[PDB]
Design a protein. Structure first.
Ligand SMILES: [Zn+2]
Length: 1036
């Protein structure tokens, strides 16, 4: 017997996918424990190997065989045989199928059947997931019947002559079609043999199969004897059974109105005389005028005028001041009033809403096309003003509709200042605009920015200014490392800022001489490992640089004067120097006292009551509480293990382990607002079934001052209203609207600003602006703030009109990722923070700095309590271990014997992955011969090839990849193995990768703990945001 394995057939079949199902699954031998076998047939069947990888039916033999090297299992629904035959166009799991059969469809109705060791199985319509592995079998059957209708090289020429119109077309190339025929040989040879029996085509095909021999087998006779247990991978596993029903979200009448209106309107449903007297004179001695006539209509400071434009739509300018030119000219100054449609909002903005901008313009009075009605909205803020705002909104909308019906001029309103450079909508400086004093604040800002572009040397000849930063003699500066003169291995060759001491300014328009400081990583990687992050080595290397190669200023002190407080995400540009590094010998020595280097010399209750929606294990809440800005008094979490973990880590919190929509409905029912609720009847029934004690502790408007959390947006095409109605972002925005918190921090994945052609982001911004918020957005990479796991997160800050929008934390660690840009419109882009790829104050955190001291554990552990065996060595271990003396959650997911063998066979070299496993039939101590190489990708499809990272180890000096949120030791494992040990990353190691302190505790199964760790904002990034918010909170 001759068989062809996956190497040749892999071209036609798609990329290998894996089988998943629900908990409904029963054994097969127990149903029928015991040629003349039961003929039970199958619905929604599927086939797989021992790794639950979908496998073509072509890999099973035709006759009896004593030993079948390839093991194959199946699943489906066992049902009564009805003699269903195919011509064109309770759940069970099978045992090791021993063969398969084509039944001769004399009336062109050929069927499909399989034989396990117990009973026959006729095959019906398969599962939709297995259809890609099902269609090629039908295609080759159609080819076989086409040749049968026709009746070796003559046949190949005949079938190559056919074009793509016929269903039995393969390819016009003789060689490719011959390869296709020889690859699917037995599937045609047996079909021809069951009809001609000794036709030359048959013997030619057999000869070709021998020419492409890949596996021999022995044909035998009746050997049925039940001597197997089940050996099925599916047997014994408990599948995930949640698939929570996406019920319609509970929303307020405002958010629902906005989203429904958007998805229903779109988606697949002259005399120029003055007026008055001058109130003063400008600096240039020009008259200052407040009011003027234009073509019979009015123009005044604080109003808006229109400028004639070439087509398109006229531009609107907010008048700042009016003056008469020296040559008796009527001229005015205005600020650009961007229309809502041209901002990042796009089509999700009202027609009547305009946004102030920093761009200014100056023009003659006679160039005005006309004056448009324009008012500034200053509605009061607070939860108690929501009903009045709703009534005013309805009245204004009715008035606008009435005016549009009678084709009257549109009345505009402005309530936000759109700054794309800062990337957000801010509050209007009502006391700084429309001053009519002849001074434009935006013009002053532009002039100041222009002044921040010149390399000017001060009169003292001992310093200069660059980028608005003053440099002086004896200061400490940053120099780009270049200016001096694998997936895991991202930060493998990136150097931090070169710290230098600027000694003398030598003119050349001048160059600066700087003495060099040497970082620990310059000596060796091991020295950088066992040393502080903020340590510098003194040296006597002086280099001359242009003044444009200086990035900032820092401080350098001794060990005695270093600050006592040590926050983990370091926001202080402070280093300490104690040792001397000699480049000639590379030897570190003590600092001699002969020179005595001139080092740097020293010379409330704002905590906000917090409601944390979708809290999870509490990473964001812990980070914000460590920064002294959040209380985490209330939390809401659907998942039971996540709520348990939150209650474990935050005992003082009040955790609601319930649906967000149900909790919102209960809150809005307690407050007395039922007519403002858009909720399903199921939500009403669930909310009505709540303990009175729980309803007594529910939050109410006025008791919440900070709402934070990340909604689980499904995203992923322009979905209709009936599909976007069930998203949790609507419930989150309804929470924000009803409670009216002073601050609102939304967190989501990087692709949040691109879901549904970016409509979700625009709609979120539109809802937040309709509420009356100041909204800013950005994308932050957690890897640049201390963690060793790259994670890009989109953050949206929202603040009350009278509050201050927090700034974005400055990245302080090197990370090789370009600027993270959000595209607004008109080719404009916004970057939240600078890309610390070519330079940063501190070196990147490596894997060894994170998991280099934890005790070793074998593959699969359950001991949740252990003791440390090695003292903390690096800076990260010392900082994250703290005073903890009991190691918790140091357990790893247990892999089967085959996966353990595969992991042990992976070499402990950087960049190693599944490409390094040897090709050999392995045999674990179970009687199950298996292929060692996990995947068999097609030779073609280069883009769909190069599957690097799967079964991949971690580089010691690399960083944790993004693909370790939920390690899965069944199919596509990914880059999750340990750098040195033969195991998957433990829960504690994954927590340390995200910056979770060793004192943090997780709850639930290992899968639940990993899901909590992967779904939480890193406590480092959360703490950085918290301290930025604390800085913003002290201004007000
Ligand atoms: Zn201006």
């Amino acid at each position: 017997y001759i068989k062809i394995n996956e190497d040749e057939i892999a071209n036609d079949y798609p990329l290998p996918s894996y089988y998943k199902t629900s908990e409904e699954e029963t054994d097969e031998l127990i149903l029928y424990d015991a040629e003349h076998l039961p003929h039970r047939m199958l619905h929604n069947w599927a086939l797989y190997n021992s790794d639950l990888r979908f496998i073509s039916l072509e890999l099973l033999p035709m006759k009896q065989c004593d030993d079948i090297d390839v093991n194959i299992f199946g699943s489906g629904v066992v049902t009564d045989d009805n003699g269903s035959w195919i011509s064109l166009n309770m759940c069970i799991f099978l045992s090791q199928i021993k063969e398969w059969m084509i039944e001769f469809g004399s009336d062109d109705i050929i069927s499909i059947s399989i034989r396990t060791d117990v009973a026959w199985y006729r095959l019906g319509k398969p599962s939709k997931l297995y259809a890609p592995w099902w269609k090629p079998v039908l295609k080759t059957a159609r080819v076989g019947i086409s040749i049968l209708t026709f009746l070796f090289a003559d046949v190949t020429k005949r079938l190559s002559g056919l074009q793509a119109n016929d269903k039995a077309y393969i390819s016009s190339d003789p060689l490719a079609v011959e390869r296709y025929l020889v690859v699917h040989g037995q599937i045609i040879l047996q079909l021809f043999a069951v009809y001609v029996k000794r036709c030359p085509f048959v013997v030619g095909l057999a000869s070709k199969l021998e020419d492409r021999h890949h596996t021999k087998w022995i044909i035998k006779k009746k050997k049925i004897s039940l001597k197997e247990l089940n050996l099925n991978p599916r047997a014994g596993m408990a599948p995930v059974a949640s698939k929570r029903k996406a019920m319609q979200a509970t929303t307020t009448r405002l958010v629902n109105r906005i989203w429904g209106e958007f998805y229903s309107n779109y988606s697949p449903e002259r005399e120029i005389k003055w007026d008055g007297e001058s109130l003063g004179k400008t600096s240039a001695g020009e008259p200052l005028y407040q009011q003027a006539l234009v073509g019979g209509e009015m123009v005044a400071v604080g109003g808006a005028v229109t400028l004639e434009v070439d087509d398109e739509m006229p531009a609107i300018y907010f008048v700042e001041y009016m003056f008469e030119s020296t040559d008796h000219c009527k001229m005015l100054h205005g600020r650009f009033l961007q229309r809502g449609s041209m901002t990042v909002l796009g089509n999700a903005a009202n027609e009547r809403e305009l946004f102030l901008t920093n761009e200014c313009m100056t023009t003659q009075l006679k160039d005005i096309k006309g004056v448009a009605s324009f008012e500034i909205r200053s509605r009061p803020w607070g939860h108690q003003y929501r009903k009045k705002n709703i009534t005013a909104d309805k009245l204004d909308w009715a008035r606008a509709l009435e005016r549009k019906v009678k084709d009257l001029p549109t009345e505009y309103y402005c309530k936000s200042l759109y700054s794309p450079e800062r990337g957000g909508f801010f509050s209007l400086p009502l006391s700084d605009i429309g001053r009519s004093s002849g001074f434009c604040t935006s013009c002053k800002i532009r002039e100041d920015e222009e002044k921040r572009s010149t390399i000017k040397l001060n009169v003292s000849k001992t310093g200069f200014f660059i980028n608005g930063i003053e440099y002086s003699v004896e200061d400490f500066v940053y120099v780009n490392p270049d200016s001096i003169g694998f997936k895991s291995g991202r930060n493998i060759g990136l150097r931090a800022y070169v710290v230098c001491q600027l000694l003398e300014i030598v003119p050349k328009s001048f160059d600066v001489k700087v003495r060099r400081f040497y970082r620990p990583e310059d000596v060796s990687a091991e020295k950088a490992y066992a040393s502080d992050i903020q340590e510098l080595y003194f040296s006597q290397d002086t280099v001359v640089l242009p003044p444009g190669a200086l990035e900032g200023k820092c401080e350098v002190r001794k060990k005695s004067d270093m600050p006592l407080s040590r926050e983990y995400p370091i926001s202080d540009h402070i280093f300490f120097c104690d040792l001397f590094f000699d480049t000639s010998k590379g030897s570190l020595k003590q600092l001699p006292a002969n020179m005595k280097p001139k080092f740097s010399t020293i010379k409330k209750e704002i905590r906000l009551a917090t409601l944390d929606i979708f809290a999870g294990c509490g990473g964001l809440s812990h980070g914000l509480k460590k920064a002294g800005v959040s209380d985490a008094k209330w939390a809401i979490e659907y998942e039971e293990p996540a709520g348990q973990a939150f209650k474990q880590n935050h005992p003082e919190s009040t955790v609601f382990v319930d649906n967000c929509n149900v909790i919102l409905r209960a809150i809005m029912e307690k407050g007395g607002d039922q007519d403002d609720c858009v909720s399903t009847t199921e939500a009403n029934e669930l909310a009505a079934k709540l303990t009175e004690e729980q309803k007594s502790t529910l939050p109410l408007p006025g008791q919440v001052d900070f709402i934070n959390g990340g909604p689980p947006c499904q995203g992923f095409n322009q979905s209709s209203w009936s599909k976007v109605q069930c998203e949790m972002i609507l419930a989150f925005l309804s929470f924000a609207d009803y409670f009216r918190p002073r601050y609102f921090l939304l967190e989501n994945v990087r692709t949040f600003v691109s879901f549904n052609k970016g409509q979700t982001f625009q709609l979120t911004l539109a809802s937040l602006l309709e509420m009356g918020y100041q909204v800013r957005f950005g994308i932050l990479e957690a890897g640049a703030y201390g963690v060793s796991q790259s994670r890009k997160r989109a953050f949206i800050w929202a603040a009350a009109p009278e509050e201050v929008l927090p700034e974005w934390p400055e990245p302080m660690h090197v990370f090789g990722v370009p600027k993270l840009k959000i595209s607004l419109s008109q080719g404009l882009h916004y970057a939240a923070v600078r890309s610390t790829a070519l330079g940063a104050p501190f070196r990147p955190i490596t894997v060894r700095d994170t998991i280099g001291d934890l005790p070793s554990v074998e593959n699969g552990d359950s001991r949740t309590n252990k003791e440390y065996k090695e003292v903390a060595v690096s800076w990260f271990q010392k900082e994250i271990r703290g005073n903890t003396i009991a190691l918790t959650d140091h357990i790893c997911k247990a892999m089967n014997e085959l996966n353990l063998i595969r992991c042990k066979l992976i070499p402990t070299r950087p960049g190693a992955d599944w490409h390094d496993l040897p090709k050999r039939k392995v045999t674990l101590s179970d009687g199950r011969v298996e292929e060692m190489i996990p995947f068999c990708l097609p030779n073609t499809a280069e883009r769909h090839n190069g599957w690097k990272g799967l079964y991949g180890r971690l580089d010691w000096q690399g960083n944790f990849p993004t693909s370790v949120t939920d390690p899965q030791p069944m199919g596509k494992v990914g880059m999750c193995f340990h750098p040195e040990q033969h195991r998957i990353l433990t829960v504690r190691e994954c927590a340390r990768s995200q910056g979770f302190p060793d004192s943090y505790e997780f709850a639930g199964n290992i899968n639940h703990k990993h899901r909590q760790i992967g779904n939480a904002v890193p406590p480092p990034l959360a703490f950085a945001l918290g301290r930025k918010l604390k800085e913003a909170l002290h201004l007000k």
